[PDB]
Amino acid sequence: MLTLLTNVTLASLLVLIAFWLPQLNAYSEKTSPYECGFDPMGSARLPFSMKFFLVAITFLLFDLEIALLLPLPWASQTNNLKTMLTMALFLLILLAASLAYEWTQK
Amino acid sequence: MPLVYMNIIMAFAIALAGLLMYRSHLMSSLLCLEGMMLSLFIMSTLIILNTHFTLANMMPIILLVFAACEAALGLSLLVMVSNTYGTDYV
Amino acid sequence: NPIIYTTLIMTVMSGTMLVMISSHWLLIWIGFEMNLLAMIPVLMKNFNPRATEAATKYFLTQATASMMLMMAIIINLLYSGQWTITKMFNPVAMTMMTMALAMKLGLSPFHFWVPEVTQGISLQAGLLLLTWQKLAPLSVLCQISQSINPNLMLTMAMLSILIGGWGGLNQTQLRKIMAYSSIAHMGWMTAVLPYNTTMTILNLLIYITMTLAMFMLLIHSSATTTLSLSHTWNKMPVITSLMMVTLLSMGGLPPLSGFMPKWMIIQEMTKNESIIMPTLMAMTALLNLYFYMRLAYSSSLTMFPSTNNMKMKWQFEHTKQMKLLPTMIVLSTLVLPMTPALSSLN
Amino acid sequence: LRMLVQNKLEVLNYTTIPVYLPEITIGAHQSDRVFQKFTELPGRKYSPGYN
Amino acid sequence: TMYIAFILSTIFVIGFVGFSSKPSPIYGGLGLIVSGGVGCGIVLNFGGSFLGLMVFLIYLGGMLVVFGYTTAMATEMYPEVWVSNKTVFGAFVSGLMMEFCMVYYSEEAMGIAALYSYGTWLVIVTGWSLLIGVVVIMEITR
Amino acid sequence: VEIIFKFNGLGDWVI
Amino acid sequence: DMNEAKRRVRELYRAWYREVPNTVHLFQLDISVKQGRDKVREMFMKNAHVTDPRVVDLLVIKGKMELEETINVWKQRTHIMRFFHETEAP
Amino acid sequence: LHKYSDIPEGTECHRKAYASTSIGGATGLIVSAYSIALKPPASFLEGVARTGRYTFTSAAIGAIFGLTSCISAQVREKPDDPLNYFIGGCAGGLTLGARTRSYGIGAAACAYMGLTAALVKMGQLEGWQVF
Amino acid sequence: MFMINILSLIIPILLAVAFLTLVERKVLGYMQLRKGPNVVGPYGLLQPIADALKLFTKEPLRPATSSISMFIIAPILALSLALTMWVPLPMPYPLINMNLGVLFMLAMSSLAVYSILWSGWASNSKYALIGALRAVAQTISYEVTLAIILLSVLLMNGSYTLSTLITTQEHIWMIFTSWPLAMMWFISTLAETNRAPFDLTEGESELVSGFNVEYAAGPFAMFFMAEYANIIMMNAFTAILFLGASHDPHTPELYTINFVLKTLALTITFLWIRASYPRFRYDQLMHLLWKSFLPLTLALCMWHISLPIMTASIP
Amino acid sequence: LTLEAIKDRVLYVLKLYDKIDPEKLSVNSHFMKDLGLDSLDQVEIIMAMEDEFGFEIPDIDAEKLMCPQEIVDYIADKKDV
């Protein structure tokens, strides 16, 4: 917790010496958002895409899977591996299987 | 029961009341639900750590899974409702 | 494609069977949880702008219900360190497990989602929702009948019948009516549950048989709005002439099978004294009957004017026969002098 | 779509929508009678394979 | 003593105070970040470290990101800060007064390693569940 | 605590 | 012939007039919201004596492109503020 | 309710009447609660107007019911028979009749509220179990 | 005096990111034949501090459209975690002996990119939003394979503790055992850190400095700085994890003398990648991953699950 | 929607408008033949009135005019009241 505090306080210190230092003139249009020169046609709205979630959700459901993969190194030392080993393979198959199902339903 | 548990339980009660006060675009509700999920998780894990009831060390993570899983589903429905409107519960 | 659809529906069957098997609580909450994920997509076949928000309703309520349930399990564990079903050991938890299940059955005043959701889906997915989904939560209530706080149960059990009544007189399109029928019968199931579970399971079987009869008939005629049902008397007169009867069996006119539930229930509760409650309950069940009757008037007993265009349709026989149907009619009607067999359920 | 092509009443399923315009709609007597007449035909009492 | 675990519980609860109030999902995502790190810290204090790091990884390192995608699909112009409405801010204060009234008032290693060898059944149903969940995502989006 | 059900109080370490 | 073209121009005035407040809004112009309208009316008075057959329709061709530009956010604050000649010495 | 239950008999009419007033107030807050919940008042001041309405009405009904009942008990001094509540029952509807400013609803409320109360007393006498 | 140890961990590293910048322009310069910075040095050496002074001296505007709170909090988090990931790193002796600090390296790495999401969200600009979004795509898309292959290379060391990972490499090095996973780890570190062929977050010519644009002086220096923190850090991580070394406890310093070589030998390589390949584009960037890397990561994963049993070689 | 609502609104919008002084106002009187307002004003006030009734006036109906009341009659023709 000590190193967390010293790091965050360090960074915050850099912020404060970043703002309260140059000591010059902010003003309008200088502070207007950048848009490669010409002014924006409108504030940021809806860059909608199914192609975002259509995969990103799959990310989420793999990440849940790897969450189950993590116990493995410790589970490897269990007294009865034949009881284990199938499962150690099993989930991975389904992981692959899930992917496989996605792979070809386009 | 030690006060800490009471505090987490209360965090649950808020994590529910927030779901049910329920307002505007519903994405907030999937958040509040996930918060609810997290409170149940923590409240479980503290217990399994307490009594050294070792087998149940497996549950919280498994809990987490399905719970996260349904939430993972939930966004998809929102997509569809977002698809025809730009979402609002209204 | 059917090959995926069948895997979903089978994993729903599994997702309920799992509740009916496992003794450990965590596997029950897993049972419902798996049940949910596999329940939503099947509501989304065909897919409508309407159907989408139907599924939104269903998911949103089932999710919050499952949440409260898991919370109350965890509290139970906190105050007794167990996972076996058995008695619960902390009333503040127990009432919440009752609430969570109260949403899962759709009992009032939690009920409001069920009439709406039914509206949003086709009669296939509808029937399945009103029968198969009613198994699992009851499947756990039978296991926790031992410690139920009867007051809390009878209050929802009654209020489900009043709301299952008054909201039934008002609607035209049939699906919403079927919703209020079921929402009303669940009051009768969950009423007797504290006193004697075997009567519950009996009533459950009758209810499922009944609603299978109706939904197979609505499928057979593809009627929906009441008027749409009205035309059917001329095309295939039999099936309207059979909706009449199955409706009366919903109504529980005494020769008919649907009377068997109520008339065992009244018995059981009467052993407990509690004499007033069944009287109010049985009186309101009448109110439940009345819109079955009005709906009968739209259909078979009287002929609403036919539209002309119907005539060509007379040449064309219905197809894709549903094998299971005739037996579902007959069992849900004629079986009354076979009550004693109920003891088979021990 | 192929499933829809078969079982033609389905393609006809919405053509008998109840809107009750006076020219299309028919009172119950005429319809009950005319359909009572339709059964009179040799091939219509029963499904075709059985008659 | 330090009561450090308990004060962490307090920051946790206000994390849900600012979170359960409903001021644009993005800031709520911040709410679950704060409550998330506080959470993993709290469970870390009993030394179930692996789990606290599961949630600090699997949850916050997973979820709130995908929510950082939903808002791209939802947003709407001029999202509200907590201060941007009387009911929202009123709600936040409403949480603060209550929780303040409340204030006024390794085994793990083999324990989870057991999941595979000694608890195959759960592995089966979780595998099956997640798989068919992917199938459901398909049968909704497609 | 009188709310809902009793919270035994004192520091966390004790358990 | 004339008149058939005059209706065109009236249509054009409707389009410009209604569009103007959107122009002041979106462009963050601080011209008095009325002033743009008046100035529009004036620009419409600028050729309020043209009498040739084809020349007037040609005038609405050259009139379309400008609202065509302001609606597409083509041109800019500078470019649309240009009409008011505000920096000129009297 | 346990507080209200220890009448005793009908002695000290005020002590009882306060309790009945309390019950009426409680039910008024509940009805107001669902009403606000399911009929979004729009403009919150109107909502508190609504709840003020129902709360005051039900509280009034409870008050007048309680005191007329106990007074009848302390006057007729019968005092145990069910009819002893029934007047209050009949009275209660009239209270409800007053706020609604309608003879009809007041008239019906008299009869049914009366019969309900009478059944309640009859039930205390007979140990009817309801649940 | 633990505090001075921490300070002793944080100052030298910041110095290292500065001189990392300078080396970057140097080597990356000589690949181009052209000499890198030189005139201000004499060997350029004085440059980075002149650079940083040029930045912090320069005015850092608070954008009119931006919400300010997120806009400030994001850089803070960036340097924060960029530094915090350094703590449990065995050199040879970790500053902290976490029982499972590797998993923690993943935790920090996974909260890293979230800062990018805010960085582009509060920036409000079109380029900001689009670039930030695609950024988060590539990032997560690589963290999944990332963590799986890291798992599979960790089944055999024994456990998640880091110091043991020295002990398990007292001879052959891990790399000879499972190099293909080392390849995928390498590239996943080449994308998670958002580097050369996997270049998209900066966007560059594709999106004019990407998410980072609207940040002006100091906060820009923070994202820049933190970025290099992650690059050297994943490099060091790979170094200890795939390249073992002789370690006499009596002379720990010897080991470190070796270690900075073995890690620096990696960092330079990224630069020598930067001078070599055109960027992927957001389709292919994710294509090669989901289609091609991943399945091998799995097959290799079952394989590595299965060796210890068949070989009877359980750690 | 009584015809009186229509007339009241027509003249309301025409009273809100500037070129039509209240003294200039007169229902039966031809909108151009009496009122001195510029020809563009027809278009401006009609577009405002229809902005109230909400429906676009096709400009053949701008070629109607004659009297404001005939336009009111057209509003009755659309409202079908």
Side-chain angles (χ1 to χ4, degrees), chain A residues 1-44 46-47 49-106, chain B residues 1-88 90, chain C residues 1-319 321-346, chain D residues 18 22 27-28 42-43 48-49, chain E residues 1-103 106-142, chain F residues 9 11, chain G residues 5 15 21 36 48 53 63 89-90, chain H residues 8 10 17 19 24-26 28 33 37 40-42 47 49 52 59-60 62-63 66 73 79 82 88-89 91-93 97-98 104 106-109 111 114 117-118 123 127, chain I, chain J residues 5 22 36 48 54 58 62 68 76:
Chain A
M1 187 172 288
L2 197 149
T3 183
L4 294 179
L5 179 62
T6 186
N7 283 280
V8 173
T9 54
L10 186 144
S12 177
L13 188 148
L14 291 177
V15 170
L16 295 182
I17 71 102
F19 291 174
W20 296 81
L21 183 147
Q23 197 68 262
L24 265 66
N25 186 31
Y27 66 93
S28 179
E29 298 178 353
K30 177 183 177 183
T31 181
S32 64
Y34 174 78
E35 190 66 19
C36 196
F38 287 150
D39 59 352
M41 291 180 283
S43 179
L46 274 66
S49 176
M50 305 299 179
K51 290 182 177 296
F52 297 160
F53 292 176
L54 173 57
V55 178
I57 295 302
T58 298
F59 148 72
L60 181 56
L61 270 68
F62 288 175
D63 194 5
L64 267 64
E65 186 67 16
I66 189 170
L68 270 65
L69 296 180
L70 293 179
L72 182 63
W74 294 344
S76 178
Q77 297 176 338
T78 190
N79 192 29
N80 52 30
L81 300 179
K82 289 194 296 184
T83 57
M84 176 189 78
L85 182 144
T86 62
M87 299 298 104
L89 296 178
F90 177 82
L91 292 179
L92 274 70
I93 278 101
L94 292 187
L95 193 155
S98 65
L99 173 65
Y101 175 78
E102 174 171 355
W103 177 273
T104 188
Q105 299 307 106
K106 295 177 179 178
Chain B
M1 63 177 284
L3 195 151
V4 175
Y5 287 141
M6 181 59 70
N7 200 31
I8 285 100
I9 294 171
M10 184 168 286
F12 168 80
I14 292 172
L16 184 142
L19 185 145
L20 293 177
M21 291 299 181
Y22 192 87
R23 182 183 60 80
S24 66
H25 47 279
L26 65 82
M27 176 62 187
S28 174
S29 293
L30 289 177
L31 266 71
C32 188
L33 188 148
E34 292 190 354
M36 186 185 289
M37 165 179 64
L38 190 143
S39 64
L40 262 62
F41 174 85
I42 289 176
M43 180 174 173
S44 178
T45 303
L46 297 179
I47 292 170
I48 305 309
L49 294 181
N50 187 30
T51 64
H52 306 288
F53 173 63
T54 61
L55 288 173
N57 284 284
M58 72 185 81
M59 75 148 287
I61 193 63
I62 279 176
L63 177 143
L64 179 65
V65 173
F66 285 168
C69 182
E70 69 186 343
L73 177 146
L75 297 177
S76 180
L77 270 65
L78 177 60
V79 172
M80 300 301 179
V81 178
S82 177
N83 190 31
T84 61
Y85 301 140
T87 185
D88 275 338
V90 67
Chain C
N1 52 346
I3 189 62
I4 190 171
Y5 177 82
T6 186
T7 57
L8 268 61
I9 193 61
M10 286 180 72
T11 196
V12 174
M13 303 297 180
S14 177
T16 297
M17 175 183 74
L18 179 61
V19 174
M20 293 175 180
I21 291 172
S22 65
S23 63
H24 185 192
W25 276 104
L26 176 61
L27 287 179
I28 288 173
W29 182 90
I30 284 176
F32 295 160
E33 184 65 19
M34 176 178 281
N35 184 33
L36 180 63
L37 299 174
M39 187 65 183
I40 291 171
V42 71
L43 275 65
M44 299 299 290
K45 65 174 294 180
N46 297 133
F47 179 82
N48 302 133
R50 183 181 293 273
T52 298
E53 195 172 10
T56 299
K57 299 292 185 65
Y58 175 77
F59 163 81
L60 191 60
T61 61
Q62 299 301 321
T64 181
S66 172
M67 286 291 105
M68 292 197 291
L69 191 147
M70 174 56 75
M71 174 62 178
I73 289 176
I74 281 175
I75 291 172
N76 184 335
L77 169 141
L78 179 61
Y79 282 90
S80 67
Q82 289 299 318
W83 288 100
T84 306
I85 313 102
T86 64
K87 181 183 174 182
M88 304 176 190
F89 298 96
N90 193 343
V92 64
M94 166 60 191
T95 61
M96 284 192 288
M97 293 185 73
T98 296
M99 296 293 99
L101 299 175
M103 283 183 177
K104 296 291 180 66
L105 269 73
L107 294 172
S108 67
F110 301 90
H111 72 280
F112 295 101
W113 58 269
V114 65
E116 296 178 354
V117 173
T118 304
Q119 187 66 262
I121 60 175
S122 67
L123 296 173
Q124 294 175 334
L127 68 81
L128 188 138
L129 186 147
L130 293 181
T131 62
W132 187 260
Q133 298 292 95
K134 301 297 185 179
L135 283 175
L138 291 177
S139 178
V140 66
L141 282 177
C142 294
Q143 301 171 343
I144 60 173
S145 177
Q146 291 78 358
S147 62
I148 204 67
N149 190 27
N151 303 133
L152 170 59
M153 189 58 76
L154 267 70
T155 179
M156 296 183 292
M158 174 63 179
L159 201 145
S160 175
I161 290 171
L162 294 178
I163 303 304
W166 297 353
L169 274 62
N170 204 31
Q171 288 76 0
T172 64
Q173 65 289 3
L174 269 66
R175 291 173 296 181
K176 193 173 297 299
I177 288 175
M178 299 301 295
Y180 288 104
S181 66
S182 70
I183 190 179
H185 286 162
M186 297 303 170
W188 278 89
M189 295 181 189
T190 303
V192 72
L193 183 142
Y195 301 94
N196 188 26
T197 63
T198 297
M199 302 299 180
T200 69
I201 178 174
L202 175 68
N203 184 29
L204 173 63
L205 269 61
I206 295 304
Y207 164 79
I208 289 172
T209 302
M210 293 297 298
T211 51
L212 263 61
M214 289 304 296
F215 283 113
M216 289 294 184
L217 265 60
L218 300 182
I219 293 298
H220 195 67
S221 177
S222 295
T224 301
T225 304
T226 303
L227 277 64
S228 175
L229 179 59
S230 62
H231 298 167
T232 190
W233 64 269
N234 67 351
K235 182 191 72 64
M236 189 74 76
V238 178
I239 60 101
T240 188
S241 177
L242 183 55
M243 286 184 183
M244 181 187 76
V245 174
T246 296
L247 265 59
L248 268 61
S249 176
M250 294 293 184
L253 283 72
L256 270 62
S257 172
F259 177 79
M260 177 176 73
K262 298 181 175 74
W263 170 61
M264 293 299 175
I265 300 303
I266 302 300
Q267 176 174 350
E268 185 67 16
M269 294 173 70
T270 304
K271 290 176 178 177
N272 305 129
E273 296 184 353
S274 69
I275 188 65
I276 176 170
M277 187 66 176
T279 62
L280 286 177
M281 176 169 69
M283 292 296 291
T284 298
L286 171 64
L287 189 152
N288 186 343
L289 176 147
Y290 161 76
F291 55 87
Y292 302 143
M293 286 303 297
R294 175 184 60 196
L295 192 146
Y297 290 153
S298 296
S299 176
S300 62
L301 293 173
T302 55
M303 300 171 181
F304 284 176
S306 178
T307 185
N308 180 32
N309 200 27
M310 188 69 70
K311 291 186 176 72
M312 61 185 287
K313 188 178 293 181
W314 305 356
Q315 282 93 1
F316 288 154
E317 78 290 8
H318 184 70
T319 59
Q321 78 285 0
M322 49 203 82
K323 294 289 284 187
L324 190 62
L325 172 58
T327 57
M328 292 301 178
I329 293 109
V330 174
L331 296 179
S332 66
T333 300
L334 306 177
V335 73
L336 177 63
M338 289 299 180
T339 70
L342 64 83
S343 294
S344 173
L345 304 176
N346 69 43
Chain E
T1 60
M2 296 298 179
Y3 294 140
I4 186 167
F6 162 68
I7 62 172
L8 286 176
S9 66
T10 61
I11 286 106
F12 178 86
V13 174
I14 68 101
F16 277 168
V17 172
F19 160 71
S20 64
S21 294
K22 298 177 295 300
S24 174
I26 188 68
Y27 299 143
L30 168 57
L32 294 185
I33 294 169
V34 176
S35 176
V38 171
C40 64
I42 292 171
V43 60
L44 280 168
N45 287 282
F46 297 180
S49 177
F50 172 81
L51 297 179
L53 290 179
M54 289 298 100
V55 174
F56 188 81
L57 177 65
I58 302 305
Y59 189 84
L60 168 58
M63 286 294 190
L64 303 182
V65 173
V66 75
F67 290 179
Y69 281 80
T70 61
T71 60
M73 183 70 77
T75 180
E76 177 174 358
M77 182 176 284
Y78 299 145
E80 58 271 6
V81 184
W82 291 276
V83 300
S84 182
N85 185 27
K86 57 182 68 180
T87 58
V88 171
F89 178 80
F92 180 80
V93 176
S94 178
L96 297 180
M97 68 168 283
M98 177 175 175
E99 183 276 337
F100 174 78
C101 291
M102 293 299 294
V103 174
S106 62
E107 291 178 345
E108 173 280 335
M110 304 309 295
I112 293 174
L115 169 65
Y116 292 100
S117 65
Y118 195 80
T120 185
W121 177 256
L122 295 173
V123 174
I124 292 172
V125 294
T126 52
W128 177 250
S129 174
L130 295 181
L131 168 62
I132 197 159
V134 171
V135 164
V136 171
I137 300 298
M138 295 298 175
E139 299 307 318
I140 290 170
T141 56
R142 74 180 298 179
Chain I
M1 66 190 84
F2 173 76
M3 173 65 182
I4 194 167
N5 189 340
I6 287 173
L7 177 63
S8 176
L9 184 66
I10 290 172
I11 305 304
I13 177 177
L14 298 177
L15 272 63
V17 300
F19 295 107
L20 173 61
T21 294
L22 189 143
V23 174
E24 187 177 7
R25 282 182 290 181
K26 289 298 288 183
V27 175
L28 189 68
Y30 285 95
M31 297 291 172
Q32 309 307 327
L33 270 67
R34 63 185 184 87
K35 292 192 298 184
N38 188 337
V39 68
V40 298
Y43 291 91
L45 293 173
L46 205 151
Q47 179 69 262
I49 63 172
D51 188 5
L53 289 175
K54 186 191 74 66
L55 269 66
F56 294 98
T57 302
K58 188 172 67 64
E59 190 283 336
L61 57 88
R62 57 180 71 90
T65 57
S66 63
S67 179
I68 197 67
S69 62
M70 314 300 285
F71 179 79
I72 295 169
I73 191 171
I76 301 167
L77 192 149
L79 288 177
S80 175
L81 273 64
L83 271 61
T84 298
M85 189 185 293
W86 278 90
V87 58
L89 200 149
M91 57 191 87
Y93 302 138
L95 191 147
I96 294 297
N97 289 279
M98 296 178 183
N99 190 342
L100 39 74
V102 176
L103 191 150
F104 172 78
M105 295 291 187
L106 289 179
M108 292 291 100
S109 181
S110 295
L111 264 66
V113 299
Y114 182 83
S115 66
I116 291 173
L117 189 148
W118 275 343
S119 300
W121 182 94
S123 177
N124 199 343
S125 295
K126 299 182 184 299
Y127 291 95
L129 183 61
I130 183 170
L133 187 65
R134 70 168 63 194
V136 180
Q138 73 175 24
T139 54
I140 62 99
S141 64
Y142 279 77
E143 271 99 10
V144 291
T145 290
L146 181 71
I148 286 174
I149 61 100
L150 184 147
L151 180 148
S152 293
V153 295
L154 263 65
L155 287 178
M156 177 171 62
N157 75 344
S159 64
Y160 297 93
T161 181
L162 282 76
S163 296
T164 195
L165 184 59
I166 294 300
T167 298
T168 188
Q169 291 176 334
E170 285 185 348
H171 299 290
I172 190 165
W173 290 0
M174 180 79 79
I175 179 172
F176 296 92
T177 298
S178 180
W179 51 269
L181 290 176
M183 285 178 178
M184 298 172 184
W185 172 257
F186 176 78
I187 283 95
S188 294
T189 52
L190 183 57
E192 179 188 6
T193 57
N194 301 290
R195 291 300 302 167
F198 314 101
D199 195 6
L200 268 66
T201 59
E202 298 84 357
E204 298 302 321
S205 64
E206 182 175 0
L207 291 175
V208 57
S209 293
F211 66 96
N212 197 339
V213 182
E214 185 67 15
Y215 292 89
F220 167 79
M222 294 179 183
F223 286 154
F224 193 80
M225 189 178 288
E227 181 279 338
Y228 291 107
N230 283 130
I231 184 173
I232 56 174
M233 170 165 62
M234 293 296 180
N235 285 332
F237 188 88
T238 301
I240 69 105
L241 185 135
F242 282 148
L243 301 174
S246 177
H247 184 197
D248 179 68
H250 305 292
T251 179
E253 184 176 2
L254 188 148
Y255 167 79
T256 295
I257 297 171
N258 189 28
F259 161 76
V260 294
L261 270 60
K262 289 160 58 183
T263 183
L264 181 60
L266 265 57
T267 296
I268 302 303
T269 301
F270 290 174
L271 304 181
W272 169 59
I273 295 303
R274 182 181 174 88
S276 299
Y277 300 142
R279 62 177 61 83
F280 277 99
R281 174 170 60 82
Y282 169 67
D283 297 353
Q284 304 177 339
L285 165 61
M286 193 173 291
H287 171 67
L288 74 89
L289 182 142
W290 285 94
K291 295 282 182 64
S292 300
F293 273 161
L294 193 143
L296 289 181
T297 63
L298 267 63
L300 272 68
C301 185
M302 290 183 289
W303 178 255
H304 288 288
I305 294 169
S306 181
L307 259 55
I309 285 98
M310 64 182 79
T311 304
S313 177
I314 300 168

